[PDB]
Amino acid sequence: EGVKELSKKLVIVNGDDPLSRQAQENATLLFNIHLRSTLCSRRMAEEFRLSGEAFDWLLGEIESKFNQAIAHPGEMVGALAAQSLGEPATQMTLNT
Amino acid sequence: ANQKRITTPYMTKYERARVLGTRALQIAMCAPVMVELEGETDPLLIAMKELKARKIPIIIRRYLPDGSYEDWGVDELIISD
Amino acid sequence: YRHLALLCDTMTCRGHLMAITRHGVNRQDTGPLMKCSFEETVDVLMEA
Amino acid sequence: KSMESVMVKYDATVRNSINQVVQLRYGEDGLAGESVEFQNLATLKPSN
Amino acid sequence: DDEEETYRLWKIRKTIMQLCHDRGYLVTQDELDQTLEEFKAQFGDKPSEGRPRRTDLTVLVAHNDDPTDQMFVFFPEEPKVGIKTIKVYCQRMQEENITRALIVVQQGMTPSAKQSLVDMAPKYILEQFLQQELLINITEHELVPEHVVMTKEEVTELLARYKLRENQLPRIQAGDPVARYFGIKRGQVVKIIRPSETAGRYITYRLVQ
Amino acid sequence: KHMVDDKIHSRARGPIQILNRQPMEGRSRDGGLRFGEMERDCQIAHGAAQFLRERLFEASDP
C-alpha cells in the first residue's frame, strides 16, 4: 500500500484526461517499475528489514527528492543542450 | 477560478530569485516591512527572512503559452527551499 | 541522453532534415533578426 | 546560433520562438540533469 | 532468374497483403502469411514466358468496415508505364464503383503521368509505387517505431486539451515513404509510439502536411 | 616580460567613442572590456536576464 500510494503520489502530467493519464504513466513508466522492483515485499522483508517509521520516512524522502528532481520551466534548455554538446566536442580530439 | 491550476504549485528558483531581488529592492529604499526582524541592516537578509516567512505582498503572473495568464500567490505557492 | 535526444528531435522536428547551415536556417521562417544574427545579415534582412 | 531559441514553457513542454511544440516533456521525462543519477536495475538480466 | 522473379513476385504479394492489413482492409490470414511454396503451387513458378505474369495476381480488397470503398492494384506489363495504359486503368476505375487504386511500376514512372495522377487524384485517389520499395517493408524495422493515424475527434480533443494548433504541432512531410505506406493525405495527424531509453515509452504527435 | 604591473587595469565609466557610445579599447585609453558573443550566450544559458540586460543596454549605451 505504501509503494502504490507513492506511485500515485508522483505526478508529471496533471489533469484527469485519459490521454493525460496515459502520457503520465508512459512518462514515469520506467521509474515506477524500478521503484516497485526495489520495493518488492521479498526484498523489504528479507534483505532490507526496515521499520515502519523508516519506511514512511523513506517514502517522504523519495517524494521530496523527486519533487526537487522535476524540471523547472523557463530554463534555457536549448542553449544549455547546445553548449552541453559543444563542450565534449572541445574536449574530444580528432587525433584520438 | 481556483480550479484551472495547470502549472505546478512548486514555485521555481527563477521565481524565488526575482521576488527576492525585488523585495530586497523596496526594503533597500525603505518601503514598510511586515515581517518581524531581529535587527539587520542589509536588505538581502531582510528579504530572505521575508521569503522564508512566506508573507510577501506580491502575486506572480505566469504566462501560459496559449496566450492566457494565471496568477499564483506566494502564500499558496509551496516553496522548494 | 536528454540533451542529445533534444538536439536530434529539434533537428528533425520540421518534417525533414535540418543541416546547421544558412542554407537551411534561412529557409525556416524563424525570425528575420534571428536570420540576421546568423552569419548572413544583409541578405536575410533585405529579403525580409 | 542554431539553437539560441529553445526553452521550456510552464506547461512542461518544449517550444521554440515560433512556439512550436517539439518535446512534450523535457528529455521525454521532465527530470533534471543534475538530479538524475546512474542506477543498476536488478529486474533485467537474471533468470526466471 | 526465373526463381528470383517468382520469389520477388511472392514477396510483392506478401508485402501487399501486409500493407493492406496495416492500412485497415479486410485481408485473410492465409494471404497475410502464405508460404512461398504455396504461392508457387498457386501460380506456377514461371513468371517469365509462363502462365503466371503481371496483372494476374492483382487483388480487390475491401475495408474491414464500410465496404463501399475498395482498393485494387495495377501491374503493367511494361517497365515504364504508359499514359495511355493509365488511361485504360482510369476506364477501369470508371467501370468500377470504387475510387482507390494503386499502381506498381517496374522502372521509373513518367513525369507526364505523374502530373496526370496529380490532376485526377481528387476525383479518385491513385497511388503509385516501385518494386523495391514495396518489396521491402518499412514497419518491420527496429529503427521504425509504431505509427497509428488518428481521427478527427481525437485531433480535436487533443488540440483542445493541449491548447496548440496544427502549425504548432510538429510536421511530417507528405511525400515521406512512411506517409506513402500509410496512404495519408495533406494535413492529417498521426501518433507515433516509440521505445524510450530513459522513460520506457514515448507518445509523439506529427502532422502530414 | 609578462609583468603584473603592465598587465593589470580596470575601468569605471571613462570615455565614449564618437561613432557609438561605447567604452574605449586597450588600457592605454583606460579601455572597456568586450562582453562578447559567446559570453552573452552563456549568460543566457545561466538565465541571468536582468544582469545581461543591464550589462548590454544601460551600462553600455542607454
Coordinates of C-alpha atoms in Angstrom, one line a residue, chain A residues 11-77:
Chain A
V11 CA 3.0 13.3 -10.9
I12 CA 4.4 14.8 -14.1
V13 CA 1.3 15.4 -16.2
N14 CA -1.7 16.9 -14.4
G15 CA -5.4 16.6 -15.3
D16 CA -7.8 13.7 -15.5
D17 CA -7.9 13.4 -19.3
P18 CA -7.3 9.7 -20.1
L19 CA -4.8 11.0 -22.7
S20 CA -3.0 12.9 -19.9
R21 CA -3.1 9.8 -17.6
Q22 CA -1.7 7.6 -20.4
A23 CA 1.1 10.2 -21.0
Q24 CA 1.8 10.4 -17.3
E25 CA 2.1 6.6 -17.0
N26 CA 4.3 6.4 -20.1
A27 CA 6.5 9.2 -18.7
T28 CA 7.1 7.6 -15.3
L29 CA 6.6 4.1 -16.6
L30 CA 10.2 3.0 -16.2
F31 CA 10.7 4.8 -12.9
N32 CA 7.6 3.2 -11.4
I33 CA 8.8 -0.2 -12.5
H34 CA 12.2 0.4 -10.9
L35 CA 10.8 1.7 -7.6
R36 CA 8.3 -1.3 -7.4
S37 CA 11.2 -3.6 -8.2
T38 CA 13.3 -2.1 -5.4
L39 CA 10.3 -2.1 -3.1
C40 CA 9.2 -5.7 -3.7
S41 CA 8.0 -7.2 -0.5
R42 CA 10.5 -10.1 -0.6
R43 CA 13.5 -7.7 -0.6
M44 CA 11.9 -5.5 2.1
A45 CA 11.2 -8.5 4.3
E46 CA 14.4 -10.4 3.8
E47 CA 17.3 -8.2 2.6
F48 CA 16.3 -4.7 4.0
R49 CA 14.1 -5.3 7.0
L50 CA 13.2 -1.6 7.6
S51 CA 10.8 -0.5 10.3
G52 CA 7.5 1.4 9.6
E53 CA 8.9 4.7 10.7
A54 CA 11.9 4.1 8.4
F55 CA 9.6 3.1 5.6
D56 CA 7.3 6.1 5.6
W57 CA 10.1 8.5 6.3
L58 CA 11.8 6.9 3.2
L59 CA 8.6 7.4 1.2
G60 CA 8.6 11.1 2.2
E61 CA 12.3 11.4 1.3
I62 CA 11.7 9.8 -2.1
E63 CA 8.7 12.1 -2.8
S64 CA 10.7 15.2 -1.8
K65 CA 13.8 14.1 -3.9
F66 CA 11.6 13.6 -6.9
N67 CA 9.8 16.9 -6.3
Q68 CA 13.2 18.5 -6.4
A69 CA 14.1 16.4 -9.4
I70 CA 11.3 17.7 -11.5
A71 CA 12.3 20.1 -14.3
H72 CA 11.7 23.8 -13.7
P73 CA 10.0 25.7 -16.5
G74 CA 11.7 28.7 -18.2
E75 CA 15.2 27.2 -18.1
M76 CA 17.2 27.9 -21.3
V77 CA 17.2 24.2 -22.2

